[PDB]
Amino acid sequence: HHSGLVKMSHPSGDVEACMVQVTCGSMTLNGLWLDNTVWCPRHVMCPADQLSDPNYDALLISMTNHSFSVQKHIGAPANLRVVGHAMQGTLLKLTVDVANPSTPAYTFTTVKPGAAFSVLACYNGRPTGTFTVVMRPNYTIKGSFLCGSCGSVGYTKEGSVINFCYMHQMELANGTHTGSAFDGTMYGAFMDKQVHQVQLTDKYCSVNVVAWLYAAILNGCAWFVKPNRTSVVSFNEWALANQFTEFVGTQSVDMLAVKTGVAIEQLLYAIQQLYTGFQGKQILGSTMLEDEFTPEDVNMQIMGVV
Amino acid sequence: HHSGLVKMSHPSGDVEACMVQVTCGSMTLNGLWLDNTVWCPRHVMCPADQLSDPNYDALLISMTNHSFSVQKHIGAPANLRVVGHAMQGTLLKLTVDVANPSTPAYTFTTVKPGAAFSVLACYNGRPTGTFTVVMRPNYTIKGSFLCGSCGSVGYTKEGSVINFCYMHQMELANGTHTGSAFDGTMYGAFMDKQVHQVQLTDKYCSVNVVAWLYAAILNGCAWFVKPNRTSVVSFNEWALANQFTEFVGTQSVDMLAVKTGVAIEQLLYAIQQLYTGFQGKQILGSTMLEDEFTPEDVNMQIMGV
Numbered sequence: 001h002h003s004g005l006v007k008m009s010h011p012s013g014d015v016e017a018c019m020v021q022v023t024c025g026s027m028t029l030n031g032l033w034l035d036n037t038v039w040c041p042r043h044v045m046c047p048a049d050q051l052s053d054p055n056y057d058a059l060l061i062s063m064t065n066h067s068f069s070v071q072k073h074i075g076a077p078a079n080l081r082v083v084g085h086a087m088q089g090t091l092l093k094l095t096v097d098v099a100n101p102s103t104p105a106y107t108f109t110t111v112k113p114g115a116a117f118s119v120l121a122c123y124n125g126r127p128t129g130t131f132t133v134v135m136r137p138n139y140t141i142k143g144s145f146l147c148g149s150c151g152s153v154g155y156t157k158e159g160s161v162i163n164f165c166y167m168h169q170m171e172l173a174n175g176t177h178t179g180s181a182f183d184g185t186m187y188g189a190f191m192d193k194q195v196h197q198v199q200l201t202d203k204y205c206s207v208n209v210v211a212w213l214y215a216a217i218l219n220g221c222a223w224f225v226k227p228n229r230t231s232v233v234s235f236n237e238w239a240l241a242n243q244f245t246e247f248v249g250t251q252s253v254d255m256l257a258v259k260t261g262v263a264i265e266q267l268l269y270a271i272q273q274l275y276t277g278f279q280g281k282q283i284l285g286s287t288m289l290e291d292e293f294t295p296e297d298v299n300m301q302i303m304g305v306v
Numbered sequence: 307h308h309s310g311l312v313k314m315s316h317p318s319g320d321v322e323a324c325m326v327q328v329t330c331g332s333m334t335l336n337g338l339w340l341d342n343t344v345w346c347p348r349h350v351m352c353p354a355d356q357l358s359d360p361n362y363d364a365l366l367i368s369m370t371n372h373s374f375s376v377q378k379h380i381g382a383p384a385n386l387r388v389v390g391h392a393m394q395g396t397l398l399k400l401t402v403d404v405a406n407p408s409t410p411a412y413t414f415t416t417v418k419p420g421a422a423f424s425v426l427a428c429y430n431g432r433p434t435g436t437f438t439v440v441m442r443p444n445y446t447i448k449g450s451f452l453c454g455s456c457g458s459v460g461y462t463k464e465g466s467v468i469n470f471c472y473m474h475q476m477e478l479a480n481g482t483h484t485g486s487a488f489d490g491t492m493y494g495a496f497m498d499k500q501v502h503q504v505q506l507t508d509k510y511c512s513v514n515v516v517a518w519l520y521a522a523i524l525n526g527c528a529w530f531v532k533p534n535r536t537s538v539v540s541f542n543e544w545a546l547a548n549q550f551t552e553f554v555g556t557q558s559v560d561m562l563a564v565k566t567g568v569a570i571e572q573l574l575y576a577i578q579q580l581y582t583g584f585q586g587k588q589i590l591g592s593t594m595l596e597d598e599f600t601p602e603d604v605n606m607q608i609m610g611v
């Protein structure tokens with residue numbers, strides 16, 4: 001029985017209309033055009049033979065407004081005149097002379113570990129694909145990014161408001177990815193320089209495992225549900241010792257509990273048993289715990305609860 | 307020998323000139339006035355009897371511009387006219403008809419666990435104290451806040467640019483505090499409602515313990531340094547099993563290693579042994595590891611960088 005769960009992204013059309021190509025000298029990557037501002041990764045300023053130890057302060061100083069070229073390729077093409085430039089953290093903030101007429105209602109936020117967001121992968125300012133990832137507890141994402149993808153954007157949607165949360169910056173040694181929030185900070189402890197970096201230990205996202213067990217129950221699969229319970233406080237002491245994130249309940253999880261009649265504490269107990277082995281059985285076609293679906297994913301896709 | 311380390315905050319004058327009082331009905335707290343915007347916690351709109359599960363969307367729809375009173379008390383006082391209101395996550399964005407003429411150069415940023423920032427504690431729109439804190443690994447701070455302190459702001463300073471990183475929201479059950487970034491998200495998993503909340507477990511900030519051990523070496527207190535080394539990788543596996551954050555080196559830490567000639571890996575080994583007990587000895591007057599001073603504190607206050 002198919003769970004009815006897929007990796008679902010937001011429709012990308014509103015964000016496609018904001019993607020541009022940014023070029024600074026011999027370097028090029030993607031930018032995001034909103035109102036009179038274009039955001040892009042600051043390493044567009046760095047000469048390719050200097051990516052290991054750039055002085056971004058001096059690089060910024062060395063630029064003028066004419067150092068940047070911004071092009072919209074898709075839809076109505078445009079070449080945007082830069083009238084101002086500023087650096088914020090790991091991003092450039094370029095001020096352009098024309099406000100994007102396709103600017104959607106938007107906000108900037110930071111995504112938290114375990115939360116899901118949609119990514120619009122772009123090359124040379126052209127959107128090429130979309131996918132959705134969960135921010136891992138070690139502040140990487142398991143994305144799909146090649147050379148030239150920097151400046152690809154990640155976002156969520158609340159109603160018609162797009163919340164931009166990610167600008168792609170780099171690939172780590174283990175093949176995962178990270179980037180910047182739009183306040184310019186890099187997720188995690190990573191730096192935007194081409195050096196090998198300490199990447200931290202990942203964990204199972206316990207709230208998302210709970211959501212997936214609820215998805216299994218909503219599909220008629222409940223062999224792992226026993227009357228036994230583990231309290232949140234006790235589960236969280238156990239989680240610290242067994243590479244799980246600590247569980248924090250939300251209204252979204254509570255809705256799944258009410259709809260199924262299975263208490264959160266029953267699933268916390270189940271996770272502790274299932275972590276020691278599935279005993280030859282499967283849950284939603286898997287023999288391992290799944291933490292890439294959120295409580296909101298489960299509520300929206302199975303129950304239609306936005 | 308006194309190390310020369312103290313808890314050092316930025317001078318607060320530039321930020322005090324941005325502080326206002328925000329009142330909505332019978333609720334009052336502090337706000338931050340930058341350009342034509344006043345930021346403040348959204349629970350200023352919530353009646354005191356409804357704080358345990360506010361419908362903030364409905365509260366916001368029910369307000370008008372006239373629901374808010376904004377006053378600047380210190381310096382050149384003013385009662386500001388509110389001409390727009392909006393909500394961004396856990397913060398209200400009030401638009402006022404006058405741009406703050408004392409608006410400093412500023413950015414908004416999020417502070418990371420282990421990093422230090424300065425807090426201007428305010429009551430009724432009036433600055434009353436300043437102190438510095440480190441963001442804990444569980445996204446709380448060990449602050450000093452009483453009723454009426456919400457909207458107090460935390461910040462760092464890079465040159466003449468103020469980087470606002472914190473707006474105060476709540477006290478947790480264990481006496482620590484948390485707040486919002488200026489994107490309106492709460493630090494950590496906390497929600498701005500008056501209910502019991504899961505508090506995640508705190509950890510030692512390994513990078514700051516390393517800085518403090520370098521401060522001891524710079525002060526001549528080096529009895530804990532041995533030839534033995536622990537690699538960053540092996541230390542980080544041990545840290546996961548011992549309530550420490552994983553270590554990530556920075557240029558600030560490297561500067562301390564070059565100055566003392568003691569390798570980071572020698573101090574990682576030391577931390578592992580010291581954590582089991584100081585064997586009756588002291589380091590910089592302490593019998594336990596200290597993680598409230600950053601590599602940058604040590605570079606500035608001891609090496610004068």
Ligand SMILES: *[C@H](O)[C@H](C[C@@H]1CCNC1=O)NC(=O)[C@H](CC(C)C)NC(=O)OC[C@@H]1CCC(=O)N1C[C@H]1C[C@@H]2CC[C@H]1C2
Nearest residue numbers: 043051145146147148149150169170171192193194195196
């Ligand atoms: C920007 O488009 C690009 C995205 C990555 C390219 C491959 N997949 C991506 O997600 N970002 C970068 O190339 C980074 C630039 C830095 C931040 C200034 N660097 C980066 O991701 O580095 C990855 C690894 C780390 C070790 C290393 O030498 N290296 C760089 C290789 C990988 C890419 C091909 C040749 C260079 C870039």
Ligand SMILES: *[C@H](O)[C@H](C[C@@H]1CCNC1=O)NC(=O)[C@H](CC(C)C)NC(=O)OC[C@@H]1CCC(=O)N1C[C@H]1C[C@@H]2CC[C@H]1C2
Nearest residue numbers: 451452453454455456475476477478479498499500501502
């Ligand atoms: C705003 O000025 C104020 C600041 C705090 C007042 C005391 N010191 C502060 O730092 N913030 C609030 O009053 C919060 C409003 C919420 C966000 C809507 N509430 C708050 O901080 O509540 C604190 C109390 C006392 C200590 C504590 O753990 N706690 C929360 C309650 C809720 C659960 C029941 C008992 C505890 C846990």
